[PDB]
Design a protein around this ligand. Sequence first.
Ligand code: A1ITI
Ligand code: A1ITI
Ligand code: CL
Ligand code: NA
Lengths: 305, 306
Amino acid sequence: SGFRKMAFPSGKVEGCMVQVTCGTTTLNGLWLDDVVYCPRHVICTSEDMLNPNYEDLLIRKSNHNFLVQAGNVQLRVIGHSMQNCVLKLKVDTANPKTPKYKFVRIQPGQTFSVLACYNGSPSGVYQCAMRPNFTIKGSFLNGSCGSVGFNIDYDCVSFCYMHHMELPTGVHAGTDLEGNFYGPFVDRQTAQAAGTDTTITVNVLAWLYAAVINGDRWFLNRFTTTLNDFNLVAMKYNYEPLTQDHVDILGPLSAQTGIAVLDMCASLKELLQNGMNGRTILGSALLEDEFTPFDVVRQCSGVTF
Amino acid sequence: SGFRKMAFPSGKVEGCMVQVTCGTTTLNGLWLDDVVYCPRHVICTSEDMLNPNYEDLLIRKSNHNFLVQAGNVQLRVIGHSMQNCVLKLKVDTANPKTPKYKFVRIQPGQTFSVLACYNGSPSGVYQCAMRPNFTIKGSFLNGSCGSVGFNIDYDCVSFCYMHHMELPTGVHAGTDLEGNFYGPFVDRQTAQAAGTDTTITVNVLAWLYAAVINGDRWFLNRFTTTLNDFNLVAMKYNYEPLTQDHVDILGPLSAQTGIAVLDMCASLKELLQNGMNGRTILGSALLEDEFTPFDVVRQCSGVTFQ
Ligand SMILES: CCNC(=O)[C@H]1CCN(C(=O)c2cncc3sccc23)CCN1Cc1ccc(Br)cc1CC
Ligand SMILES: CCNC(=O)[C@H]1CCN(C(=O)c2cncc3sccc23)CCN1Cc1ccc(Br)cc1CC
Ligand SMILES: [Cl-]
Ligand code: NA
């Protein structure tokens, strides 16, 4: 038993991290097959970054301007191009450690593991959710750009995030691996701000189920509610709407625990209205919203990779 | 910016995980060089588990009674020995993925990464602290025995924990890699209970420093305290004593933030008295005690957001 914020094993991704240098800038890249992917902002001086013309800046660069190092081994760049906000450096060597992989774009509320890297070297791993406002609450310092986020299923690494920048409020923004930003952000040093965030309701419900599975049940009650009535409450408390698809996805946990989703919604309604009255749930005094239903089932059933 | 419970990248340890089977029991082992380490309770049946005589159980085993599988490959056992509560199986193949490594026995309050594994296959990685009562609060199911805990400061893997059992209170117990239990526990299914746990005071202080580094000061106050008065108060909230060693270890964080250690102690005293009044610290509504001073320096900026 026990329930912890758990990342995927990172080994398959560690073997893909490289160091990319352009002029005075060093950041991280992802080496898959014979391509290294990194943020296109690698090509910008501090002055360029204020208002970059990436097409014009890139035309002035040749292959030789990009130095790529995998551990102690130099990879020779033999081509370069941009896709959206990602730079693709074709290299002369296919990564022998390339895992089975896909590029996937995730939706708000979904979780993933971040492998924080500096100078091409992995430094730490932790779980994040894509917030409703399309930021992530990561932990990133100067030099972390090009760090990636991923999920695993069986043997296949699904890459979903590449880190581009920190916003003024200390949260993080980036792209999918095809270089499309999550959220209304651009790769320019200009005033940008995350929208007001909301709480991921379906994930809070999942975590309440995790709590029940782990023997923490004080918040259960005799009441139920309707989807409509619950959603009036969610809106009042800055929670995302709960949809029928969310209810369907939670169906397993309902069956296992004997608490229908709308039953658990009545618990959540009461917690929102009344607080915890000095108690905790799974050791938390806040309602946790960065576990998906799948995360709960995975962890509670010991799925391996 | 940001502050998360951050594990070490697990790849160096993943390449060492194997499955060990003895009779009907399968659990995890750690394959380093030509040795596989696992809990000695692998040799016990359910009948054996109350009062196992491990010497008597082991003498009855041959090398070929142990099956070791690394992925799809069977490793041949060519010797075995018991060291304290760990079994060491000598195998005919050195692990080609053996990282630079060492074995370290840690003290209460120290943190490490756990790679939870089942059937020799990794499931996930997360951070744990050795609690003052020598348990850990992990996430471990049936089949997770032999999962390990480790740090990877400076490219070398320091193995510090091997998982042996869950206690009745739902917390976890295990050994160092020399097979010595943390705490008073034994590898027998007899009544044992952990001591009442306490809060790791030095770690709470470290995390308050992390909050200041990351730009938040709301919880500071104009007061100070002596060390002895701090301890008299904090013990009333089930906090561990703060020692001069702890004060010394907090020196770098104190220097980076300009907040004297005993002044941060005065802040903590007031937080214990007052609660948060609806605020959070680094996204938490409780006082976090599973980040060490070293963990904070590892993760945070060296420049305070003033
Ligand atoms: C030389 C030109 N490159 C830059 O300026 C790089 C510098 C490196 N950065 C990091 O390594 C870092 C990452 N993650 C967290 C932190 S906290 C302090 C530093 C970081 C910050 C990102 N900026 C670009 C940038 C900055 C702001 C905005 Br808005 C947009 C953009 C464009 C996407
Ligand atoms: C066949 C004889 N072996 C056993 O019985 C094994 C069975 C496997 N176990 C696990 O895989 C497991 C791990 N971590 C968490 C959980 S939650 C449910 C199960 C687990 C539990 C540990 N016990 C032994 C055991 C049990 C209790 C105590 Br006290 C001491 C001991 C001796 C050290
Ligand atoms: Cl230690
Ligand atoms: Na109910």
